[PDB]
Amino acid sequence: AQSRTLLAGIVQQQQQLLDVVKRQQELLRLTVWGTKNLQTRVTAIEKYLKDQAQLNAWGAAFRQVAHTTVPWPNASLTPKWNNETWQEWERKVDFLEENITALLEEAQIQQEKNMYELQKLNS
Amino acid sequence: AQSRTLLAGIVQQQQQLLDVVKRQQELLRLTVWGTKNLQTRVTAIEKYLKDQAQLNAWGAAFRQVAHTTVPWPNASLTPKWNNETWQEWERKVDFLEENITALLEEAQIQQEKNMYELQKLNS
Amino acid sequence: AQSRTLLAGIVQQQQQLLDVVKRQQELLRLTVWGTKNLQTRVTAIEKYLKDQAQLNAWGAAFRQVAHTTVPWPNASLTPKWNNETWQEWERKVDFLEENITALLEEAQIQQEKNMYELQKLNS
């Protein structure tokens, strides 16, 4: 009179939920790539911003043998405050990622065991 | 002596977990919109960067009837390398999204069936 | 002849899945911070873009006591269309976040109850 058939469905439902959770993990990685990719473009833009500062006044002098160049900084480069804070951000993802992998590995071992034990009841 | 009341709670817990997973999917879409929205702003910025290149030296000549215009490229536009790679990124999200929807649809059909069978035991 | 040992494993598997889901929530917050952080950098860049517009032609005149300054807008600032739309984006995350917390709180109360009832069967 045991509801093993019902347990088989419940145990299977957990497996399907585990698979979807894993998919979210891979989808999250794709989103992280887009954000980082934008930063690479930003670095290229700072460089061009610097080139402007070089552009100030050309030929602004026809009775002098000199050219005035004023390369005043344009892109505010972050050396420490963002870098140190950004490293912390990347690291937290690393600890959470490692933790999720540990739980997933345990769920797989346990999920297989739950199913293996179920087979023994009706093997 | 069967623990159907306990199964009712377990089956219900799976339904609540399924709902939260779905919420993460919608939340993920909102995050994707913010990243893409930033790219649209970036495209507008490249345009203004191009306008600078046009600015070089105005009136830098009062004894000549000519103006020196040097529109040297400023924004490095990505035609293929990023576009081809970005398309792949968007596509992987598409295949993972389609896969998650398939698993969710199966979980709903199965979740309802697990509950429907439980009612039969105590209907 | 009841499979309580099997239920103990199934109930435990749900707890492990709940923990991983929570981790995704915290990981999602880190991703949101990176996107917003990029916007702060963008605001700094608009400012420097504005400074360029100020740079037009310096010393472009040695027989006149005047300087031509043309600060034509450079960064297209979004006052309403993006702000109003961005607020909606942040708000939807707020409603989904609040909803996920409610479901998580119910799952914890129910998860503990499912385990508590199981102990009674074999306490």
The Cα C12–Cα B37 span in angstroms is 42
Q: Tokens 């939260």 map to which residue?
A: B20
The Cα C119–Cα C123 span in angstroms is 5
- Give the residue from B24, B26, B37, B90 with the most A CB atoms within 10 Å of its CB, the best one to mutate: B24
B34 chain-C contacts, CB cut-off 8 A:
32, 35, 89
CA distance A57 to chain C (A): 5
**In this structure, what token pair is assigned to residue C61?**
């005149």
**In this structure, what token pair is assigned to residue B44?**
């507008």
CA angle, A5 then C13 then A24, to 5° = 105
* CATH code of the domain covering residue A11: 1.10.287.210
Residues C72, C76, C79, C85: what is their CA dihedral angle, to the nearest 10 degrees? 170
Q: Tell me the C-alpha to C-alpha distance, in Å, between residue C41 and each of A62, B43, B44, C37.
A: 40, 16, 16, 7
The Cα A58–Cα A52 span in angstroms is 12
Q: How many CB atoms sit inside 10 A of residue A24's CB?
A: 20
B64 chain-A contacts, CB cut-off 8 A:
62
Q: Are C9 and A114 in contact (CB under 8 A)?
A: yes
Q: Are C33 and A90 in contact (CB under 8 A)?
A: no
Q: Are C10 and A15 in contact (CB under 8 A)?
A: no
Task: Give the E-state strand segments of chain A in sequence order.
Answer: none
Of A6, A114, C113, A12, residue with least CA distance to B9: C113
How many helices (H) does chain C have, and how many strands (E)? 2, 0
C57 secondary structure, DSSP code: -
Structural domain harbouring A71: 1-123
Subunit contact C21:B16, Cβ cutoff 8 A: no
**In this structure, what token pair is assigned to residue B14?**
């799976």
Using only C-alpha atoms, what is the Rg of chain C?
29
CA angle, A14 then A16 then A17, to 5° = 65
Domain count, chain B: 1
Q: How many CB atoms sit inside 10 A of residue B103's CB?
A: 18
State the chains in contact with A (3 or more Cβ–Cβ pairs under 8 Å): B, C
Residues ≥6 apart with Cβ < 8 Å to C62: A61, A62, A63, A64, B62
The Cα C72–Cα C54 span in angstroms is 7
Would you put residue B59 in left (φ > 0), alpha (ψ -120 to 50) or beta? left
The Cα A45–Cα A4 span in angstroms is 63
Subunit contact B34:C103, Cβ cutoff 8 A: no
Q: Are B121 and B2 in contact (CB under 8 A)?
A: yes
The sign of the torsion formed by the CA atoms of A104, C123, A2, B110 equals negative
B27 chain-A contacts, CB cut-off 8 A:
none
Q: In this complex, how many residue pairs, one in chain B and one in chain C, have their CB atoms less than 8 Å apart?
A: 118
Subunit contact B82:A28, Cβ cutoff 8 A: no
CA angle, B76 then B79 then B84, to 5° = 125
SS3 content of chain B, % helix, strand, coil (to 5): 75, 0, 25
C72 secondary structure, DSSP code: -
The Cα B121–Cα B7 span in angstroms is 11
Subunit contact B13:C114, Cβ cutoff 8 A: yes
Which chain B residue has its CA at the smallest distance from A20's CA? B100
Residues A51, C74, B70, B62: what is their CA dihedral angle, to the nearest 10 degrees? -110
**In this structure, what token pair is assigned to residue B96?**
């993972």
What's phi and psi for B73, nearest 5 deg?
-40, 150
Would you put residue B36 in left (φ > 0), alpha (ψ -120 to 50) or beta? alpha
Subunit contact C41:A45, Cβ cutoff 8 A: no
Q: Are B51 and C52 in contact (CB under 8 A)?
A: no
Which chain C residue has its CA at the smallest distance from A89's CA? C30
Of B34, C76, C41, residue with least CA distance to A82: C41
Residues ≥6 apart with Cβ < 8 Å to A74: A46, A49, A50, A52, A53, C48, C51, C52
**CB-based burial label for B111 (10 Å; 0-12, 13-18, 19+):** buried
The CA-to-CA distance between both ends of chain B, in Å, stands at 16
The sign of the torsion formed by the CA atoms of C33, C35, C41, C43 equals negative
